[PDB]
Coordinates of C-alpha atoms and ligand atoms in Angstrom, one line a residue:
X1 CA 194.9 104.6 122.0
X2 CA 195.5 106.7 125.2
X3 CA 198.3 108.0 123.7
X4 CA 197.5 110.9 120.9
X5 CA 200.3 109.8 118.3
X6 CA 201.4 111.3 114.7
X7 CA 203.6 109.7 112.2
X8 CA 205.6 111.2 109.5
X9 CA 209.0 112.1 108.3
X10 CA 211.3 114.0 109.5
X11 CA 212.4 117.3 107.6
X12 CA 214.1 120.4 107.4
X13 CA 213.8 123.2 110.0
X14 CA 215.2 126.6 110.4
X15 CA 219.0 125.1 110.9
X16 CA 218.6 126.2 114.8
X17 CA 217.5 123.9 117.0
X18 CA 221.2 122.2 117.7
X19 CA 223.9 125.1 116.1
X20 CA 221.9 127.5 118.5
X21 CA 220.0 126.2 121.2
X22 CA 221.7 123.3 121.5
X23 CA 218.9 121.2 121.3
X24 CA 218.4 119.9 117.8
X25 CA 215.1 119.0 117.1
X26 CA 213.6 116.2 114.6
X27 CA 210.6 118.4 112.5
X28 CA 207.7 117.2 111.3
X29 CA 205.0 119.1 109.9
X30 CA 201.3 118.5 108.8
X31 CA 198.2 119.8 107.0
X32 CA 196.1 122.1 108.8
X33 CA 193.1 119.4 108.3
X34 CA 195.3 116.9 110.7
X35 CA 194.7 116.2 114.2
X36 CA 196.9 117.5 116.7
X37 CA 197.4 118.3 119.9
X38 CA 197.2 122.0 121.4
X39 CA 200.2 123.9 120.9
X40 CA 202.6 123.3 124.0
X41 CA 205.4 121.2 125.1
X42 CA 205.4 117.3 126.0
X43 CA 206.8 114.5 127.1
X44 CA 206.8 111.4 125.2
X45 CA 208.1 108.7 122.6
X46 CA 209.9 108.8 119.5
X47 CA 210.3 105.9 117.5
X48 CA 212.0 105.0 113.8
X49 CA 209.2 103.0 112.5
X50 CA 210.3 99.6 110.8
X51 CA 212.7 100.1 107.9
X52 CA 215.5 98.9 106.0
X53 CA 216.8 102.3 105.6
X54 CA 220.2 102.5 107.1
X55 CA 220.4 104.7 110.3
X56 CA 223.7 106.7 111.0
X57 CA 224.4 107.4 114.8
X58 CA 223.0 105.9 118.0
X59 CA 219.1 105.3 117.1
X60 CA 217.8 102.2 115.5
X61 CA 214.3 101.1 114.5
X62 CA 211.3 100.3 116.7
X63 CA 212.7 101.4 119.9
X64 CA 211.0 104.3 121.6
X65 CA 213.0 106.7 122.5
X66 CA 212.6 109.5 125.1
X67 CA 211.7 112.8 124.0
X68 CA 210.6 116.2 124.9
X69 CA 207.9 117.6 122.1
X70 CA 207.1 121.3 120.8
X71 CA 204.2 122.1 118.9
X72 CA 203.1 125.5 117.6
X73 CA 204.9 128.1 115.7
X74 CA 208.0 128.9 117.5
X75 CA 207.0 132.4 118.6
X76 CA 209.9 132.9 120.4
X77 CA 211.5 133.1 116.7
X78 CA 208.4 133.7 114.9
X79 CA 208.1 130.8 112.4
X80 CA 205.8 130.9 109.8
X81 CA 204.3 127.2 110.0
X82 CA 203.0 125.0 112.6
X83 CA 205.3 122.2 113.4
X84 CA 205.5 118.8 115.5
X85 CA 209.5 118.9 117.0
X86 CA 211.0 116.6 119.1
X87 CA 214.0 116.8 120.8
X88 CA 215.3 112.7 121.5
X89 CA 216.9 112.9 124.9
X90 CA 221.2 112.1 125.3
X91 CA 220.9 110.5 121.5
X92 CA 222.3 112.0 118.2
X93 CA 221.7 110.2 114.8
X94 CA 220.5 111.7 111.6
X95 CA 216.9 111.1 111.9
X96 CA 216.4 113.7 108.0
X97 CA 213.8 111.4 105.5
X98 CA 213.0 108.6 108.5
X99 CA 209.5 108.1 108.7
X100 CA 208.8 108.5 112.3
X101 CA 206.3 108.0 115.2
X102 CA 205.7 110.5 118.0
X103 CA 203.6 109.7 121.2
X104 CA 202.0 112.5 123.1
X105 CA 202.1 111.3 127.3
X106 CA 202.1 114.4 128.9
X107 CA 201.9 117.6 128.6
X108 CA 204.1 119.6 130.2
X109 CA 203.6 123.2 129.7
X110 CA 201.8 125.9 127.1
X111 CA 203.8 127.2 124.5
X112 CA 205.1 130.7 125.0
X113 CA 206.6 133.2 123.4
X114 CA 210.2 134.3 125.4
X115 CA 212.0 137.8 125.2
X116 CA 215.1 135.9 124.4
X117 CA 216.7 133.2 123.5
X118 CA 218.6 133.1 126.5
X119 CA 214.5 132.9 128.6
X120 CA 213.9 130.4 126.4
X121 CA 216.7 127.8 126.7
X122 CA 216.5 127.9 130.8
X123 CA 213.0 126.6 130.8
X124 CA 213.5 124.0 128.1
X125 CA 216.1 122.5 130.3
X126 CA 213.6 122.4 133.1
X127 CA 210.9 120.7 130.4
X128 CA 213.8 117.7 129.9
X129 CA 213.6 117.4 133.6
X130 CA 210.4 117.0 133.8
X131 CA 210.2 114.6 130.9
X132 CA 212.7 112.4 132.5
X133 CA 210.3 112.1 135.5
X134 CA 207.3 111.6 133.1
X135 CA 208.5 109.0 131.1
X136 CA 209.6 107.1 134.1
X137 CA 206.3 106.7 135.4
X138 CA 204.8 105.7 132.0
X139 CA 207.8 103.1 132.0
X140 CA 205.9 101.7 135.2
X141 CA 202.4 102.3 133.8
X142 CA 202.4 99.8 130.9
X143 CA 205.2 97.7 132.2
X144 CA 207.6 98.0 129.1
X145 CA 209.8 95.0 128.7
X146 CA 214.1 97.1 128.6
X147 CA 214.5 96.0 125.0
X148 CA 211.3 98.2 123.9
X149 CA 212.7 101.7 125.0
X150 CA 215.8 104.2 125.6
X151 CA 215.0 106.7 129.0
X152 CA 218.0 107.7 130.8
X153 CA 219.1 110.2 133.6
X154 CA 220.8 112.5 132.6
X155 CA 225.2 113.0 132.8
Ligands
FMN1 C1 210.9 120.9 124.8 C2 210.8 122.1 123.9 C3 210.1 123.2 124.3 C4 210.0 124.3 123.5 N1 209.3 125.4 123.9 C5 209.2 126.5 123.1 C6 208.5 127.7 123.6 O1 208.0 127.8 124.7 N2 208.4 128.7 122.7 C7 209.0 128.7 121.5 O2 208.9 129.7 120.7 N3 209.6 127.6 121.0 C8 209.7 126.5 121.8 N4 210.4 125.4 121.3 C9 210.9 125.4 120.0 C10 212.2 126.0 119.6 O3 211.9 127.4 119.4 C11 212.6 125.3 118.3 O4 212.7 123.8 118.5 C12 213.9 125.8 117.8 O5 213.7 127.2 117.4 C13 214.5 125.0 116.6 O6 213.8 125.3 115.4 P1 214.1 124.3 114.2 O7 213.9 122.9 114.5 O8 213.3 124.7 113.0 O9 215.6 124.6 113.8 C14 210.5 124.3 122.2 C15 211.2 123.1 121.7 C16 211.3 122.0 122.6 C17 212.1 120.8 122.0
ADP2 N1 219.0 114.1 120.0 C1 218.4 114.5 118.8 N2 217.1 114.8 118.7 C2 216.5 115.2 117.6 N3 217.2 115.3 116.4 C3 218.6 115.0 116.4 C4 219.3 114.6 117.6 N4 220.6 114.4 117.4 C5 220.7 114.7 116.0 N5 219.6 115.1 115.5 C6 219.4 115.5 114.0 O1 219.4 116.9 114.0 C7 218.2 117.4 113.3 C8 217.6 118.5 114.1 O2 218.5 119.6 114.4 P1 217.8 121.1 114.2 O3 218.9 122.1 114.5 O4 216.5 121.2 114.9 O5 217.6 121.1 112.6 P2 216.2 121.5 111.8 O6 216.1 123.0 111.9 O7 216.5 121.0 110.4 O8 215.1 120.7 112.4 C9 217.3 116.1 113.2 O9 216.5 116.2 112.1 C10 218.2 114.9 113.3 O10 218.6 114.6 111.9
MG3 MG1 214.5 120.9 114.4
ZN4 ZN1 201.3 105.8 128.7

């Protein structure tokens, strides 16, 4: 399709993503052989593929929810593996051992490693803006019917 998608559960990270950046991200990771996109940030879909697995918070199956995407290493923090992170947009739910789908719309910017923390939390707040816009336009794109996906502005 036109949109570059992986699927896979979601794992354990480096425990920072929401305690310290305040944006938790849902990790997925993949053999070196698999295709991916570049390293960089995106804007794009998450969605709980169909289960009977309970879901705990405000997610349930086979919606697509809006997200904004990292992949790479993290260099800001220097990570040792490449993941596939995304950050679902004015949700929480424990997404840990879901097998999920991520879609790849846009991209939004090249990964880059910040001086801070700080450096790096003021541009990922721009990236969400940006995504909002995106996804809003792919909305229109294929028409989605309102029962299909979650994209809000945000509070
Ligand atoms: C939209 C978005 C943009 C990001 N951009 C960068 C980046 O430019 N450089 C970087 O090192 N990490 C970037 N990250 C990743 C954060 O470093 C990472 O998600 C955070 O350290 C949490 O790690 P963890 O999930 O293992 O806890 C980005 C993450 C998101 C969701
Ligand atoms: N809006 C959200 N987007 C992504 N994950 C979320 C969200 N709200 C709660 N979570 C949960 O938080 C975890 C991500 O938080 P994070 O600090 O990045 O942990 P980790 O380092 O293990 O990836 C997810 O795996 C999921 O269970
Ligand atoms: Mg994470
Ligand atoms: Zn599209």
């Amino acid at each position: 399709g036109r949109h570059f998608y992986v699927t896979g559960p979601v794992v354990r990270g480096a425990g920072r993503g929401g305690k310290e950046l305040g944006f938790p991200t849902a990790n997925q990771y993949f053999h070196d052989t698999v295709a991916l996109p570049a390293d960089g940030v995106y804007a794009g879909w998450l969605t709980i593929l169909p289960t009977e697995a309970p879901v705990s918070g405000n997610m349930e199956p086979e919606v697509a929810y809006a997200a904004a995407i990292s992949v790479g290493t993290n260099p800001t923090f220097g990570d040792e593996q490449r993941s596939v992170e995304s950050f679902v947009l004015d949700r929480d739910a424990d997404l840990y051992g879901h097998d999920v789908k991520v879609e790849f719309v846009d991209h939004v910017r090249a990964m880059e490693k910040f001086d801070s923390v700080e450096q790096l939390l003021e541009v990922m707040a721009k990236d969400v803006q940006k995504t909002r816009t995106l996804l809003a336009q792919d909305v229109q794109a294929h028409k989605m019917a309102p029962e299909t996906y979650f994209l809000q502005a945000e509070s």
